[PDB]
Amino acid sequence: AWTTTDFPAFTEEGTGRFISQKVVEKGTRPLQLNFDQQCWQPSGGIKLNQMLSMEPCRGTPPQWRIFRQGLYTLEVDTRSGTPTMMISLEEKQCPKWDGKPLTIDVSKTFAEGSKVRDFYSGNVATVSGGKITLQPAFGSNGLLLLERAETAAPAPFDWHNATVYFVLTDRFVNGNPANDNSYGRHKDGMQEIGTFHGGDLQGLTSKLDYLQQMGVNALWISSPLEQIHGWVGGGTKGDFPHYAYHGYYTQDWSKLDANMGTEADLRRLVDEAHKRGIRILFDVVMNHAGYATLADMQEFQFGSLYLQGDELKKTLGERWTDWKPGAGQTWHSFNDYINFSDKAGWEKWWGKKWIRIDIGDYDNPGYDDLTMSLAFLPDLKTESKEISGLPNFYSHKPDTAAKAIPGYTPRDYLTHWLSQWVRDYGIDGFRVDTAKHVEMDAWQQLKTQATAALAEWKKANPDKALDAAPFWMTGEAWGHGVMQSDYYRHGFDAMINFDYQDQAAKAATCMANIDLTWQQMADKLQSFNVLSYLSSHDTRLFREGGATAAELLLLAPGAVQIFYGDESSRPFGPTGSDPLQGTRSEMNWQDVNGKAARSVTHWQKIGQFRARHPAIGMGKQTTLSMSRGYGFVRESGEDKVMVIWAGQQQ
Ligand SMILES: C[C@H]1O[C@H](O[C@H]2[C@H](O)[C@@H](O)[C@@H](O[C@H]3[C@H](O)[C@@H](O)[C@@H](O)O[C@@H]3CO)O[C@@H]2CO)[C@H](O)[C@@H](O)[C@@H]1N[C@H]1C=C(CO)[C@@H](O)[C@H](O)[C@H]1O
Ligand SMILES: C[C@H]1O[C@H](O[C@H]2[C@H](O)[C@@H](O)[C@@H](O[C@H]3[C@H](O)[C@@H](O)[C@H](O)O[C@@H]3CO)O[C@@H]2CO)[C@H](O)[C@@H](O)[C@@H]1N[C@H]1C=C(CO)[C@@H](O)[C@H](O)[C@H]1O
Ligand SMILES: C[C@H]1O[C@H](O[C@H]2[C@H](O)[C@@H](O)[C@@H](O[C@H]3[C@H](O)[C@@H](O)[C@H](O)O[C@@H]3CO)O[C@@H]2CO)[C@H](O)[C@@H](O)[C@@H]1N[C@H]1C=C(CO)[C@@H](O)[C@H](O)[C@H]1O
Ligand SMILES: C[C@H]1O[C@H](O[C@H]2[C@H](O)[C@@H](O)[C@@H](O)O[C@@H]2CO)[C@H](O)[C@@H](O)[C@@H]1N[C@H]1C=C(CO)[C@@H](O)[C@H](O)[C@H]1O
Ligand SMILES: [Ca+2]
Ligand SMILES: [Ca+2]
Q1: Tell me, what DSSP letter sits at residue 14?
Q2: Helix or strand (DSSP H, E) at 518
């Protein structure tokens, strides 16, 4: 085994990685690693959170300086042939743990003489006098994930035990750089806060094995449908150009956005996801279309400018979208050139039958959630019973798959266009944006049509259909909690739960603090399902949990949502004058393969445990009473688990 002075013998934590943990005092010490008769020492400078190259031991061992007192993790990586190592620090009433084995009373859960596995370590104990003795493994944070040893593979998929991975496709993996600048889109050459970074469906497809190993069984992607081609001013200060990289500014529901890739790319993503038992969720919008942009105005011949003729080409250029702020201007300054009052010019856009907006001759937005122009976005007239025809500007968009359908309202078109993707690709469900800004009847129509569409795809593709499960729909209704609201009787199988974030925050430094929240949720969600999260694109990134974020999310009752990079502590990125933008930072793949490697392994083990046990997502909870540490049992049908947390090691 791998060993160094003062540290316990190293144990495997992910294939080819071995770790040891020990509370170290301030000071300096020599650092060598021994394996059999081999001696290795850091060849370069010894630093924290960095891949340290190593040499066969020679002369005096290098000095490892301990700047702060705390729990240190040493890691050795033997995958690249020659050993490299990683040093990291965890600094700083809560149950306390002396670091020694736990004797657990399992008499009420696991049968006398039966074998019980701690899934995290793989250690197996035989129940004797209703008790087992187990040492929580290095990296477990003092967790025992106790299951019947006969447990061997994932349980059947259930939405009420789902592990959803929410990915902003643009910010994940760039599979093909060729499509990064579709429709003449530009990088900003600054911090790329609001630009298309170039992540695409091909790139996402390449990481399906990565997601499968994490116990992900539902992949929620940012809308891949054709966005506004151009940009608007970013944040409150216009400090960056804001493009539709997040998929929430849709222009054509009938077409894929060229940045995301081809129909063949979507087909492969969905088919390869299904092969790995991963369901696909589209993020969808019916509330609004994207803002007017110079790109779209020029391309599709709509809107009015205060500029005319060649002074137009003087100020904005040959392509208006190529405009950049001059001295004393911001990225909002382009609005000064646009005549939003002009009725005739702006009717050429969506048209009066389609949207409410405070532009030209359009129906005025209302002063309520359903008919307001949210963040000045054109509000689609979902409640309208008027036969609309196509949006006016589609007359200048010959690549559209949209066709005029006799008797169709805007709502009929929207539900038809979204349902088309379900029918053609077998999309398993939707996450619905801006749920509280569209009338309930519109969401029911979408669900009914989407349900019929999936049933039709599964019938036509019996070789590809994983099961005969109905279409699934979740929604974001701002501030929704753990309640079976009227959304659940208008097409929604689960609503996104805003309240879990703050409860997890209160347990960030002591996992046991979550107990009441878990008891309440286990009890309430016997009758219905919610989708809970630590991190999202419109709140913040949960990074206060230290190394405990995995268990805080994945051991929650109900469906849970991993925001891409939760598993690798993806840092809050450049944000400018929009405080949400930093949540959409680039996926940190360099960290995944380096300083966050053991974090990914930790997330994989807890995620895989969840996938084996519907008792986690669906089970009634009994919180145990023990003299040492914290523990609960959950039970769903024949499935029964015990989670023990030893407590704080410091
Ligand atoms: C996505 C597409 O981007 C590029 O072409 C687009 C231009 O950037 C736009 O400005 C616009 O140009 C058209 C003018 O508006 C129009 O007045 C007329 O002059 O024709 C222009 C050229 O069509 O629209 C363009 C097309 O969207 C880029 O040059 C092009 O390669 C890109 N097309 C990809 C998309 C698909 C669809 O799956 C593939 O078939 C292509 O091979 C891709 O390259
Ligand atoms: C002030 C306003 O606050 C909350 O609004 C939420 C939206 O419900 C939520 O969808 C989200 O909006 C973003 C949207 O999701 C995204 O697609 C788009 O690109 O950007 C939007 C950013 O705004 O976030 C906002 C909060 O920032 C409440 O849900 C709203 O009810 C609330 N509205 C107020 C204001 C009025 C007008 O007088 C009343 O009609 C309304 O009853 C009141 O609640
Ligand atoms: C560890 C690795 O991290 C980053 O590479 C990422 C890419 O950023 C990301 O776009 C994606 O690209 C791969 C794609 O998934 C796949 O379909 C295609 O066939 O190959 C693409 C390129 O690998 O995923 C990778 C990996 O997550 C950085 O950009 C890389 O610099 C970085 N490379 C490592 C790799 C090794 C090999 O063990 C080290 O020895 C080396 O020092 C370091 O460069
Ligand atoms: C802004 C302007 O764009 C288009 O005009 C272009 C011509 O089509 C080209 O042949 C060449 O002359 O360059 C022109 C500018 O690029 C479009 O055809 C026009 O309709 C459009 N005018 C808008 C402006 C208005 C007022 O500001 C409205 O009166 C009018 O309806 C808008 O379409
Ligand atoms: Ca790309
Ligand atoms: Ca609305």
Answers
A1: S
A2: helix 515-524
Enter the DSSP assignment of 648: B
Resolution limit, Å: 2.0
As beta bridge partners, residue 22 has: 72
How far, in Å, CA of 440 to CA of 580, rounded? Answer: 28
Question: How many residues are present in the chain?
Answer: 650
Q: Please give the Cα distance from 239 to 186 (Å, whole number).
A: 15
* 8-state DSSP, 332: T
Could you give the CA distance from residue 498 to residue 500 in angstroms, rounded to a whole number?
6
Same domain assignment for residues 173 and 237: yes
The answer to whether 46 and 65 are in contact (CB under 8 A) is yes
> Is residue 279 in some structural domain?
yes
Total domains in the fold of the chain: 3
Q: Compute φ and ψ for 120, nearest 5 degrees.
A: -65, -45
How far, in Å, is the centroid of ligand 5 from the Cα of 264? 15
Q: Which residues contact 599 (CB under 8 A, 6 or more apart)?
A: 547, 550, 567, 568, 569
Indicate whether 131 and 168 sit together in one domain: no
Whole-angstrom distance, CA of residue 200 vs CA of residue 252: 18
Beta strands in 361-434 (DSSP E): 379-380, 429-432
Q: How far is the CA of 589 from the centre of ligand 3 (A)?
A: 7
Same domain, 417 and 529: yes
Candidates 105, 82, 443, 399; CA nearest to 252 is 399
Count Cα neighbours of 561 within 13 Å in the Cβ-side half-sphere: 28
Residues 493 and 542 both lie in one domain:
yes
Query: How many other C-beta atoms lie within 10 A of the C-beta of residue 316?
Result: 19
Residue 129 lies in a domain: yes
* Residues 217 and 281 placed together within one structural domain of the fold: yes
Characterize the bridge pairing of strands 115-118 and 33-35: unpaired
Do 122 and 207 share a domain, yes or no?
no
Whether residues 434 and 559 share a domain: the answer is: yes
CA–CA gap between residue 13 and residue 611 (Å, rounded): 19
Question: Which of 50, 86, 590 maximizes ligand 3 atoms within 8 Å of its Cβ, making it the mutation to test the pocket?
Answer: 590
Q: How far is CA 500 from CA 409, 530, 532, 561, in A?
A: 38, 10, 6, 11
Residue range of the domain that includes 639 = 102-151+619-645
| 586 burial type by CB count under 10 A (0-12 exposed, 13-18 middle, 19+ buried) | buried
Q: How many helices (H) and strands (E) does the chain have?
A: 14, 32
| Domain membership flag for residue 73 | yes
Cβ–ligand 3 distance for 213 under 6 Å, the answer no
User: Contact, 16 vs 77, CB < 8 A?
Assistant: yes
Q: Whose CA is nearest to atom 7 of ligand 2?
A: 478
* Coil vs helix vs strand at 115: strand
Q: State the ligand closest to the CA atom of 306.
A: 4
Nearest to 535 by CA among 168, 281, 139, 140: 168
Ligand 2 pocket check for 367: Cβ under 6 Å = yes
579 falls within a domain: yes
Residue nearest to atom 24 of ligand 1 (CA): 183
Residues 187 and 251 in one domain: yes
Phi and psi (nearest 5°) for 587?
A: -60, 135
**Closest ligand to the CA of 434:** 2
Query: In the PDB record, what is the listed experimental method?
Result: X-ray
Nearest to 639 by CA among 100, 151, 61, 194: 151
E-assigned strand segments in 222-366: 225-227, 231-233, 241-243, 250-256, 279-284, 355-356
Structural tokens at position 269: 């993503």
- Find, among 70, 73, 67, the residue nearest to 88 by Cα: 73
